[PDB]
C-alpha cells in the first residue's frame, strides 16, 4: 500500500504502510521518515479527522490517497 | 564450473554377437568384402558378406556410450571414423578392431560424417550447430605425445545438423539440418559458398558426385531434390516416397538413386527420367541407412539397415529385366510388385528390451524384450537370473509383488537396447537395506546395513588400484562380471570415459580414471566414508479402543531401518509394563490409521503404503 502525504506547502510524501496499522503507527513512521512530531500531525481524509486509536481501514483509507496533513503548532 | 558427473554401467554378456537394436549406418569394404554395422545399441560389429560363410560374424569394437548416428570408412578401408550421440567422434581401426583416439570437440549429439577420399578429409557435424573438418592423416597420427589437433571448424549453421556430405575431391561440403537449408562451404578455405533453399522440412540424406557440381538431398518430408551447385538451384524433385526419406544411395555413374525411409520400402529412380521406378523390396521396419555393393556396375545387391535388429541384403539382378518388361502402369490402382520377396542374405539380430519394470525391493528388474520375452535381472549383482520367456508381463509383476520398500537409488534407461543403470550423487545413496533382506548372510548371523549404491560402486571399481585396502578388494560381498562396461558421462551431455571393469587393472585406464571419476565416487570407493543416514520422525499415541487416557504426544525420531518390532517392544516395556517380543506380539498391537502393522515391516514402508499423507507419520498402540 502507498499513501500520498500532502501538507499545506504542496509537498507530497510517500509512505508504505498497511491498513491494519493504526493511525498512531502511521504518525510515528511519518515522524521517523520526515521529522514531523506525531502530535503536530493533523490528518484529514474526505473531511474526516483521523484518530490515533483507529486504523487506516477503520477510516477507509485507500492506496495512492492524498491525505491533507495539517501541521499543528503549540504556541503562537 | 564443472557439470554433473553421472556414473553409468551396462548389464550385458561378454560378446553381443547379433544386433540388439536398430542399425543406424552401414559401410562396405569391397577389398575385404566386410560389412560394418553401426547399431543403435552403441556397438560396431564387423560382418563377412561372403555368402558361403556359415557365420558372417568376424569381430566387434565397442567404445560408444550411445547411438552411433553415422560411420565413414576411410584410408582405403584401414581406419573407421564413427559419429555417435555421446557427443564424440572416434577413430577406430577397421582391420584390427579397436579405437585409437576419441574426439570430444562437439558439444551435442554428432549426427553425420562426410568423407573426401582424394584428400582423406572427414567432416563431423552434430546437433550443436557446428561443423569440424578433420584430416585422417593427422587424426590417425594422434598419440600420447601429440593428442591436440587444431579444431578446423565451419561457421554459419543456426540449427542442429542431421546430415553431411563431401564430394570425393574434397572441395564442396554440404550440411542439412532442421533449418531446412543446405549451407555449402568450401572446405579448402572454409569460406561460405551458398545456401540452398527449397526443402520444407528436415534433411537427413545428402549425396555428392565426384566433381562436387551436383548434390542429392534426402528430406524428412518425403521428397528428393537434385541440386546443381553451379547454378545454386535444384533441377528436379522426386516425390517417390509416401512417408519420409532418411537413407539415400547412388551408383558411381550418379545415374540411379536408391531411396528408403519410414514407409519401409526402397525404390530405384532414374535421375535423368524419374518416370520409371522399381521397388527393390518392402522391409519389415523403416530403413535408416544403406550401402550399395560397389563391386560391379550395375550394383549386384544393396545392403539395408532398418529399425529392426536384422540386416538384410537385397538382390538387384533383373532390374534391367523389370524395366524391359514394359509394365508402364499409368493407373495408380495397380500396386507395383516388389522385385525381391525375401532377402538374399540375412544377418541375424537379437531382441531389444522395450519395457522395463523395477520391483519394489529396487534390486531386481523385469524387462520385456521385443520377442515379448520377459527377463529377471539383478542390478546389484549385474547378472540375469531367469529368462521367464513368453509369459504375460503384468501377471508376472503381480506374482512378484513385494511388501517391502527401498528408496530409489538409480535409474534404468534402455537407449542402447540393453539394460543400463545410471547412478547420480543426489539419490544413489538414498537406499539402505538390511543384510538379511539383501540376501547376504554373515557367518556369525550379524545383519549390517549396506548402502546398495555404495556397495555397487565399490564393486564397479574393484580392480582399481587405489581401492585395494591393505588384500581386500571391492566390497567383499559379490563380484560384478568383469566384462561389464562402466561409463562416467556428464549429466545430459558428453561422456568423459568408458571402460570395462577389468580395464582398471592396467596403467593408462588407471591414470585416466582418477581424472575422469568425480569426488563423490571417491567418497565411498576409496575414502570408505559411510554415507549419510536418513532419519524418521514419528508420533506415539494411545489408541482410542485401548481405553488408556491420552498421553503426551511424544515426537520420537529414529532411522528408517528400525523394525516396527523394536518400536513395539519399547512401547510394551515403557508404557503398559510401567520372550519379551512374543509376549508383546500376543498382547500389544500397533496400528497406523487403525490397522495392525506387521512387526517385520519397516517404518518407511509404513509411510509409503499405509499413512498416505504429507504430514508426519503417526503410530497408535
Amino acid at each position: 500500500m502507498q499513501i500520498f502525504v500532502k501538507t499545506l506547502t504542496g509537498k507530497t510524501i510517500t509512505l508504505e504502510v498497511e491498513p491494519s496499522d493504526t493511525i498512531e503507527n502511521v504518525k510515528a513512521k511519518i515522524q521517523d521518515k520526515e521529522g514531523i512530531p506525531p502530535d503536530q500531525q493533523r490528518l484529514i481524509f474526505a473531511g474526516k479527522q483521523l484518530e490515533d486509536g483507529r486504523t487506516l481501514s477503520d477510516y477507509n483509507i485507500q492506496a495512492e490517497s492524498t491525505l491533507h496533513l495539517v501541521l499543528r503548532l503549540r504556541g503562537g | 564450473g564443472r557439470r554433473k558427473v553421472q556414473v553409468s554401467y551396462v548389464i550385458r554378456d561378454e560378446v553381443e554377437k547379433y544386433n540388439r537394436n536398430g542399425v543406424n549406418a552401414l559401410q562396405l569394404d569391397p577389398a575385404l568384402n566386410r560389412l560394418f554395422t553401426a547399431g543403435r545399441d552403441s556397438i560396431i560389429r564387423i560382418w563377412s558378406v561372403n555368402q558361403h560363410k556359415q557365420d558372417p560374424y568376424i569381430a566387434s569394437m565397442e567404445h560408444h556410450t550411445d547411438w552411433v548416428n553415422d560411420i565413414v570408412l576411410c584410408c582405403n578401408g584401414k581406419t573407421l571414423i564413427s559419429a555417435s550421440s555421446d557427443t564424440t567422434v572416434k577413430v577406430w581401426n577397421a582391420h584390427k578392431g579397436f579405437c585409437m583416439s576419441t574426439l570430444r570437440t562437439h558439444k551435442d549429439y554428432v549426427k553425420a560424417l562426410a568423407y573426401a577420399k582424394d584428400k582423406e578429409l572427414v567432416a563431423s557435424a552434430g546437433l550443436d550447430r557446428q561443423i569440424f573438418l578433420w584430416d585422417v592423416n593427422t587424426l590417425t597420427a594422434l598419440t600420447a605425445s601429440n593428442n591436440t589437433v587444431t579444431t578446423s571448424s565451419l561457421s554459419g549453421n543456426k540449427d542442429s545438423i542431421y546430415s553431411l556430405a563431401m564430394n570425393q575431391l574434397g572441395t564442396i561440403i554440404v550440411s542439412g539440418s532442421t533449418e531446412k537449408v543446405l549451407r555449402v562451404w568450401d572446405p579448402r578455405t572454409c569460406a561460405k559458398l551458398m545456401k540452398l533453399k527449397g526443402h520444407t522440412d528436415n534433411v537427413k540424406a545428402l549425396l555428392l558426385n565426384r566433381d562436387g557440381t551436383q548434390c542429392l538431398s534426402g528430406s524428412s518430408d518425403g521428397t528428393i531434390r537434385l541440386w546443381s551447385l553451379g547454378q545454386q538451384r535444384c533441377i528436379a524433385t522426386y516425390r517417390v516416397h509416401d512417408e519420409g526419406v532418411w537413407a539415400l544411395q547412388v551408383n558411381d555413374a550418379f545415374t540411379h538413386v536408391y531411396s528408403g525411409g519410414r514407409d519401409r520400402k526402397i525404390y530405384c529412380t532414374d535421375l535423368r527420367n524419374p518416370d520409371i521406378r522399381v521397388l527393390i523390396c518392402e522391409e519389415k521396419a523403416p530403413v535408416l541407412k544403406m550401402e550399395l555393393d560397389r563391386s560391379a556396375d550395375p550394383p549386384p545387391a544393396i545392403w539395408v539397415a532398418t529399425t529392426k535388429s536384422t540386416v538384410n541384403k537385397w538382390t538387384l539382378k533383373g532390374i534391367h529385366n523389370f524395366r524391359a518388361s514394359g509394365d508402364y502402369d499409368n493407373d495408380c490402382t495397380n500396386p507395383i510388385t516388389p522385385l525381391c520377396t525375401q532377402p538374399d542374405q540375412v544377418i541375424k539380430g537379437g531382441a531389444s528390451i522395450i519395457q522395463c519394470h523395477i520391483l519394489n525391493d529396487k534390486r531386481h528388474i523385469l524387462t520385456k524384450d521385443t520377442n515379448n520375452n520377459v527377463a529377471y535381472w539383478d542390478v546389484l549383482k549385474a547378472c540375469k537370473v531367469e529368462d521367464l520367456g513368453k509369459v504375460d508381463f503384468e501377471d508376472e509383476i503381480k506374482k512378484r509383488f513385494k511388501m517391502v520398500y527401498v528408496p530409489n537409488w538409480f535409474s534404468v534407461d534402455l537407449k542402447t537396447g540393453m539394460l543400463t543403470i545410471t547412478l547420480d550423487e543426489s539419490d544413489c545413496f538414498a537406499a539402505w537395506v538390511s543384510a538379511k533382506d539383501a540376501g547376504f548372510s554373515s557367518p556369525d548371523g550379524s545383519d549390517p546395513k549396506l548402502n546398495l549404491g555404495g556397495l555397487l560402486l565399490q564393486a564397479l571399481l574393484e580392480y582399481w588400484p587405489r581401492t585395494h585396502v591393505n588384500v581386500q578388494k571391492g566390497n567383499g560381498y559379490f563380484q560384478v562380471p568383469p566384462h561389464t562396461p562402466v561409463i562416467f558421462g556428464e549429466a545430459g551431455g558428453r561422456t568423459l570415459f568408458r571402460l570395462l571393469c577389468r580395464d582398471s587393472g592396467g596403467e593408462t585406464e588407471s591414470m585416466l580414471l582418477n581424472e575422469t571419476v568425480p569426488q563423490w565416487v571417491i567418497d565411498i570407493t576409496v575414502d570408505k566414508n559411510m554415507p549419510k543416514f536418513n532419519k524418521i520422525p514419528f508420533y506415539l499415541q494411545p489408541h482410542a479402543s485401548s481405553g488408556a487416557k491420552t498421553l503426551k504426544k511424544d515426537r520420537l525420531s529414529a532411522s528408517d531401518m528400525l523394525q516396527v518390532r523394536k518400536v513395539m517392544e519399547h512401547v510394551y516395556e515403557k508404557i503398559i509394563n510401567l520372550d519379551i517380543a512374543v509376549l508383546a506380539e500376543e498382547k500389544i498391537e500397533l496400528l497406523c490409521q487403525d490397522q495392525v502393522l506387521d512387526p517385520n515391516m519397516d517404518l518407511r514402508t509404513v509411510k509409503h503404503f499405509i499413512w498416505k499423507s504429507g504430514g508426519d507419520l503417526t503410530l497408535h498402540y
Binding site: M1, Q2, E18, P19, S20, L56, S57, N60, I61, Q62, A63, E64 | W67, S85, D108, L127, S155, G156, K158, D159, S160, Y162, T178, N202, S220, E243, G244, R262, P286, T307, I354, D413, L414, K415, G492
Partner: protein
Amino acid sequence: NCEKRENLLPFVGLNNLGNTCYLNSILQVLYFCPGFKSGVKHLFNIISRKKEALKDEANQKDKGNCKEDSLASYELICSLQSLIISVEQLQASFLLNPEKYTDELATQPRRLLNTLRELNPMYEGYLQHDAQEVLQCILGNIQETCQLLKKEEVKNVAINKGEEQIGFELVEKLFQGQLVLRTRCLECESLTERREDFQDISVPVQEDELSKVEESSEISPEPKTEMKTLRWAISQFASVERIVGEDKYFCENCHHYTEAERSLLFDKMPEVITIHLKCFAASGLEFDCYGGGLSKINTPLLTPLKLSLEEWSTKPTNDSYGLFAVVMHSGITISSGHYTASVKVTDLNSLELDKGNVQSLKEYEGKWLLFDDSEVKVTEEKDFLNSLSPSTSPTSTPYLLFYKKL
C-alpha cells in the same frame, strides 16, 4: 468545485476496501461478460430452490450431513448474485434520478470480499493480489459448484430444452476450451499428442534481453525487424517449438532423448478467450541470485481489437473474436501498482437477466471505460488504443485481455 462538473456516469463503479483494485477490476470485467450474469442468476435460482427444499425436508429427514464445503461453495454464488443485484439496483436508481448521488456512484463489495477471504485464506487483510489469480479462483469455485449441482441433479434423476442446460456448465461453456499437445519426434517422426483443457492463454511478453546474436556479422544478421504484435506472441505460445539442447523429448517409440517439435492446437474454443499477458520477466539474469531477478515489461504489445486463432486451430476456424475488456496495471514493478479495468460496454440486446427467474443505455454503446476503483471515467476508442500502444503510455501496461466470440 466544477473541475469535473459533478458529472457521474450511469455505470456503477465499486468502492474498493482499501487495496481491492485487483478484485474490483475483475468484478467489473466479469460483470460485462456475455451470459455470466444470466448464468449466475440461473445458479442462484437453482441454489435457492435446493436450499428451500432442504429446509422443508430437514425435519422429515434424519442425520442431515450439511457439510460446510458445499455450504461455502453455495455461499460464493449467493454473494456473487447479491452483489450483482445490488449493483444493478443502484444503477437503475441512478438512471431514474441522479440527484442523490452527486458524489461518486459505487457499491461496496463487502460480501464477496468476505466470501473470498473465508474461502481462500490468503485474501485476509488488505494486501495486494494478482487480478488473474482472483479471476481463476472465482471461475474455479463457480465451476466446482456447477459440477456439484450437475452431479446432484443426475443422481436425483437417475421445442427447445437447452434453457435448463445453459447454466449447469457455465464455466465450461464460457471460459474453458480444448488444446492438442502435439509432439513430433525428429528421429522417428512419430506424432504423440495430448488433449488438455484450458481457460486462459498464457501469452509471452519478451524484453530485448534474450536471443542475442553472438556476431551478427559473419552469420546472417536477422530476417526482419517488427514490433511484437499479439499475433507474434500467440504464435510464440502455440507454434512449432524445436525442443533442443538441455531439454529433449524422451520418445518412448525409440527410447531416446530426441529433438521434438511441439505445436499446441486449438480444437474447442470457449466463448470468452482470456489472454494472460506475461508483462513480468525474469530479466534474464538473476541479479547475483538476489532472490530472483523479478521485473516488469512496461512496454506493451500491439494488441488488436480482433483475433483469429485459425493459424493455430486444428479445424478451419471461421469465427473471429473481438476485444471487449482489458485489465491494466499502472505501476512500475510487480509488487505494487494500481489495477484498472477497461471494458467495452456493448451487447445490450443480449444484456438481459436470466430467463429461469437497450436504447436507454445505448448512449455509451461501443465505448470504452476506465474503472479506476470507485472513480469511473469514460475513455474514447481512439485515445484508448493510442495509450495502449507502447509509444505513449509506459505506465498503464495491459495485463489481461478478454475476447468474446462473435
